[PDB]
Ligand binder design. Structure first.
Ligand code: NA
Lengths: 109, 111
């Protein structure tokens, strides 16, 4: 019984050791794609989170989580969740997932 | 001189993922999904990568042109810092090709 991400999961992935980031491991993300796709492909679409808001319009506030952070809705990316050590830390509020998706929807159409 | 700003539906040549792969196959084509105003203002764009080799995967969208067909990998959306990493324009996809790419993404993250 290994974890497979589902939509709305707040996940931590290991930082990418090839990027040369000064920040330690653990990059938080919100999973957008559904379990069936994630499970059959080993990939998922997700948006990265940051603890520090800057007041940019695609930021979505995530409340109630262990820490206060924001999802960056415009920064959608496909990740190989297996290879990135995805671990579920929590779930975002349905209103928060919905808002992330709405912003992306408007951006892509 | 001003830099080319990717527009929605453009096919760009971009260093798609410099941290990985070879320095010979690093630059690849990508289809731009986000609107001009966003791309211009932010220096970023959402795009999907293209490949020369189809495999019959369900998120492949055929790109048909006057020189060698390709496929866009519609589920592999990525945000790219086009302004910082450099992007150049290779062409523009058909309205129908862009529409199919977006319909496929809609399956995964729409509503
Ligand atoms: Na310029």
């Amino acid at each position: 019984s290994r974890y497979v991400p589902d939509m709305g999961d707040l996940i931590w992935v290991d930082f990418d050791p090839t990027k040369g980031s000064a920040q330690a491991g653990h990059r938080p993300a919100v999973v957008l794609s559904p379990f069936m796709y994630n499970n059959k492909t080993g990939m998922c679409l997700c948006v990265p989170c940051t603890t520090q808001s800057k007041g940019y319009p695609f930021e979505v506030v995530l409340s109630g989580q262990e820490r206060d952070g924001v999802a960056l809705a415009d920064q959608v990316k496909s990740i190989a969740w297996r290879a990135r050590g995805a671990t579920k830390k929590g779930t975002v509020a349905p209103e928060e997932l919905q808002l992330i998706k709405a912003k992306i929807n408007v951006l892509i159409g």
